[PDB]
Design a protein around this ligand. Structure first.
Ligand code: ADP
Ligand code: ADP
Ligand code: MG
Ligand code: MG
Lengths: 52, 371, 57, 57, 371
């Protein structure tokens, strides 16, 4: 009984370890990057060009 | 180098580099040509907006999905979608990256062969491999057995697997999926006065379905309750105002999954095709499949489906077996997470279809040993 | 702030589910062992009744 | 959206907490049951040896 | 050093070191290759599961016994079974241990010669000896006379022995055994609706036979009783639920032993081949053989056989002789216990077939003085 339980537990541990390595390698390393602005409230510079 | 785990899907293209947790870029797979005339000169109007750009200009476009039911019906549009995915959403040239596409079970051969021919000739990848969409969803759960019901947006398929040995004679593929539920919801909304017809308004009906619909635990009791009280009527604001109130259309739209007779389909619901798929398996692995039923795919995200399905199967199955339904919170991207895990394995590194092999045997290499 | 709160709740959820699954596995093991024990009981009784018959005869 | 998601995530976390507690209860109950089973087994074994001796004689 | 008392058998391999009470490792002798395709990569899937490992993965294997009727029909599989037995169930290298195999009477010579050649060339044992499976069962009873009916799972043989002098002209070997009873039970279960076909489900039918079947004291009365009342119908739970109810199939399966006409065999039952084996003996040792009838082997474990057989023989035999049937509770391992006793004897220590002797005369040494 103990041997079979140990073997099954080791198999589950191996599969979950592979999953966890997959979690480790690429999780947030290239994850959420804001790449936004502060809306430039103090920007008081306008333009008088209209061709574009 | 790193591998590109693309996943064509039907409704949302999910892609990203192998070894991460979530796809880098997820965007609808629609290509919409403009339909009106256009009077402003020099506005820089393109001839086809693809991906997420055509979900913002959808007011003057005619969106058309290039993938109908798993199979690909319009190869030029699919090529355009792939080109966009590689160059603008990931910005990595395909000349330096292996690719791992995904394909539904029991699909036509010509679709797969054309897919590999495109990937090798147009984009000129180093090596590509095609995998069945259910084995990946089984990878992501960290299991090695279990019967996975991957109810996508195009096609719902139910692949049972034991100890890593797939059972090819027990795959039950059914063509009811999220798109048919969208059409049926759009058809039953007309019973209150709201008419959505344009291909752009199908997106609005899809949003209604995602945000409001839920699967009833017991259908008749809900039908009786919604017909007496008014505690179910939830309202929703269209993209221009004029809020609408959905009554018992809420749980009638996703009920089609368990009674495909609503949209005229003959077959049995997703609650009974799983039991049939189990009963085709051998008599000694039925307990394990009963205990490890896995849900995946987008359409299995309805609030309250993991209980309705368990109740139905417990009704069908013998009383002694334990019925357990695995419903991870990351259901939508389960296939892609599994794809990343599979592409990150060292043992898998020699299964890719190398380009020299394709040059020697032609596109029919995919059906050969390199599956 | 809210995103961080959600992340931490997720961490708690994942760890606790690991705990619960391990306990369930333990339960299944106990179930099989109980089954074996009852099996032992039955076979013991049967053999004992047999030997009782032989003894008396 | 983030706050609603936080509420639901805490909901799921608490549900799994309660389920795991119930499972631990069942685990310990089956544990004491298993010990009782082992003792019954040993008693039956001794009885068996005894009756075998008697029959031989 | 200590001797290895292996006992190939047919259905259960029993092994262990000489001088103990029970075999150390008992496990079915089946080797099953997987039959499905297998989709998980890196799962560590082997090409053949042997022994007790293939009784847990039997849902996706095709189990096949390497020993049909005493004789060995598939030498590679038998070699694999022996290798497993030595290295994994006992963990003792064979280079440092004598072995004592067992063989049924009247078996083909080539089987025995190949067995000794394998043991001396592949496993490279120091010395091995082959003994008849009935003399050991007579050792275990502590007798020195008596006629032993060793109804194994492969073949039933009936060797009479007096004062240590075996009677070679009175051995009656019959090929009905436990396996044919399993097949007949599997064939009569179809009369209620339960169909077992797969080679994996033969194991389930074997379990049914072991746990439920019993030998009727009087056949016609039981057939009449089971056809009127319902006090016999015992139920049993399959490995997945759906309990089954066995009616008069309970005592009809093992009745085949006493009426081999059920499975189409011509010969007489085990109740009459024993009497015939006795009557071939000399007229002055028939009383002792009548009084010391010994039962052994697995298949003689049916509840109520030691009374049916005694009733039958008392009907056949002369009224004055006393008929006694020795049925020890340790029937299943009787042959192996006897083997341990024989290997532990000092007088027997010079009967082994030493390796130098085999090198000088070849495998045909076994038929010579070292029997
Ligand atoms: N949160 C949600 N609730 C209900 N339905 C959803 C939800 N998210 C997506 N869907 C449905 O699932 C579909 C997306 O499925 P998806 O798994 O992307 O398909 P594919 O297998 O092609 O990737 C959408 O069309 C939508 O109808
Ligand atoms: N308790 C039992 N009741 C009835 N039949 C049994 C029992 N145990 C074993 N058997 C039958 O006996 C067979 C095992 O016989 P065994 O003595 O192991 O054969 P061998 O001589 O090859 O070792 C099994 O196939 C089974 O059919
Ligand atoms: Mg999908
Ligand atoms: Mg035997």
């Amino acid at each position: 009984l103990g041997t079979r339980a140990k073997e099954s537990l080791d198999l589950r541990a191996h599969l979950k370890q592979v999953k966890k390595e997959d979690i480790e390698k690429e999780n947030r390393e290239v994850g959420d990057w804001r790449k936004n602005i502060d809306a430039l409230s103090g920007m008081e510079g306008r333009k008088k060009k209209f061709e574009g | 180098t790193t591998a590109l785990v693309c996943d064509n899907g039907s409704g949302l293209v999910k892609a990203g580099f192998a070894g991460d947790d979530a796809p880098r870029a997820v965007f609808p797979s629609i290509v919409g040509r403009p339909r009106h005339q256009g009077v402003m000169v020099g506005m820089g109007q393109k001839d086809s907006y693809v991906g997420d750009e055509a979900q913002s200009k959808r007011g003057i476009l005619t969106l058309k999905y290039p993938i109908e039911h798993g199979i690909i019906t319009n190869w030029d549009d699919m090529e355009k979608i792939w080109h966009h995915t590689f160059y603008n959403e990931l910005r990595v040239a395909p000349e330096e990256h292996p690719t791992l596409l995904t394909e539904a079970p029991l699909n036509p051969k010509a679709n797969r062969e054309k897919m590999t021919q495109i990937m090798f000739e147009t984009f000129n990848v180093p090596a590509m491999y095609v995998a069945i969409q259910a084995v990946l969803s089984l990878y992501a759960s960290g299991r090695t057995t279990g019967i996975v019901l991957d109810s996508g947006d195009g096609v719902t398929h139910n692949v049972p697997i034991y100890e890593g040995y797939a059972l090819p004679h027990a795959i039950m593929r059914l063509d009811l999926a999220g798109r048919d539920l969208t059409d049926y919801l759009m058809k039953i909304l007309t019973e209150r006065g709201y008419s959505f017809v344009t291909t752009a308004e199908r997106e609005i009906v899809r949003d209604i379905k995602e945000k409001l619909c839920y699967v009833a635990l017991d259908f008749e009791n809900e039908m009786a309750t919604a017909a007496s009280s008014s505690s179910l009527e939830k309202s929703y604001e269209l993209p221009d105002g004029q809020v609408i109130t959905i009554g018992n259309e809420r749980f009638r739209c996703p009920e089609t999954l368990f009674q495909p007779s609503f949209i005229g389909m003959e077959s049995a619901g997703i609650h009974e095709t799983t039991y049939n798929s189990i009963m085709k398996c051998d008599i000694d692995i039925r307990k394990d499949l009963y205990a490890n039923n896995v849900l995946s795919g987008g359409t299995t995200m309805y609030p309250g489906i993991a209980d309705r399905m368990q109740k139905e199967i417990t009704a069908l199955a013998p009383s002694t077996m334990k019925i357990k339904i695995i419903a991870p919170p990351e259901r939508k991207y389960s296939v892609w997470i599994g794809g990343s895990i599979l592409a990150s394995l060292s043992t898998f590194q020699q299964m890719w279809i190398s380009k020299q092999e394709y040059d020697e045997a032609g596109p029919s290499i995919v059906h050969r040993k390199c599956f | 702030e809210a995103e961080k709160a959600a992340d931490e709740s997720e961490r708690g959820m994942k760890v606790i589910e690991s705990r619960a699954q391990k306990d369930e596995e333990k339960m299944e093991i106990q179930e099989i062992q109980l089954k074996e024990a009852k099996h032992i009981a039955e076979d013991a009784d049967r053999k004992y009744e047999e030997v009782a018959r032989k003894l008396v005869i």
